[PDB]
Amino acid sequence: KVTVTLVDDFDGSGAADETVEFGLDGVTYEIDLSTKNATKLRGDLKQWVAAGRRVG
Amino acid sequence: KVTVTLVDDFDGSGAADETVEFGLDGVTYEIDLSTKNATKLRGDLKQWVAAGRRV
């Protein structure tokens, strides 16, 4: 059979639960992550977002 | 005197050297940072950038 899986991009340990969008230096990225890893990414960026300013 | 300073947004303590653009969950941000803190931010994102895909 042909099996198609949405795999977690960060640790590859299991399936992803969501696709998270983020950005750096004018480049936009997407990443498929478990709920746990999406939570880690959001946590890593939390204080930076709090210190930054919204722009278009 | 009117004193003007470009202040690091993250630590409020150092002089800012550059503005970094970044984004999370569909919102885009700018932040003025010392060279050291800009490197810290880019470092925090390094593992995620490497694992993710453009657009």
UniProtKB/Swiss-Prot annotation, chain A:
Keyword Glycoprotein attributed: no
Claim: Transferase is one of the keywords in the record: no
Gene Ontology CC terms: cytoplasm; nucleoid
Changes after translation: The three N-terminal residues may be cleaved by proteases in response to external stress. This cleavage may be required for oligomerization, which leads to chromosome compaction and protection.
Domain of life, source organism: Bacteria
Transmembrane regions listed in the UniProt entry: none
Annotated keywords: Cytoplasm, DNA-binding, Repressor, Transcription, Transcription regulation, Virulence
Molecular function GO terms recorded: acyltransferase activity; DNA binding
Cell compartments where the protein resides: Cytoplasm, Nucleoid
Quaternary organization: Homodimer. May form higher oligomers via protease-activation.
Swiss-Prot/TrEMBL domain comment: The C-terminal domain binds DNA and the N-terminal domain is involved in dimerization. Both domains are essential for normal function.
Function: DNA-bridging protein that has both architectural and regulatory roles. Influences the organization of chromatin and gene expression by binding non-specifically to DNA, with a preference for AT-rich sequences, and bridging distant DNA segments. Represses expression of multiple genes involved in a broad range of cellular processes. May coordinate global gene regulation and virulence as well as genes important for adaptation to changing O(2) levels. Protects against reactive oxygen intermediates.
Family of this protein: Belongs to the Lsr2 family.
Protein name: Nucleoid-associated protein Lsr2
Protein encoded by which gene: lsr2
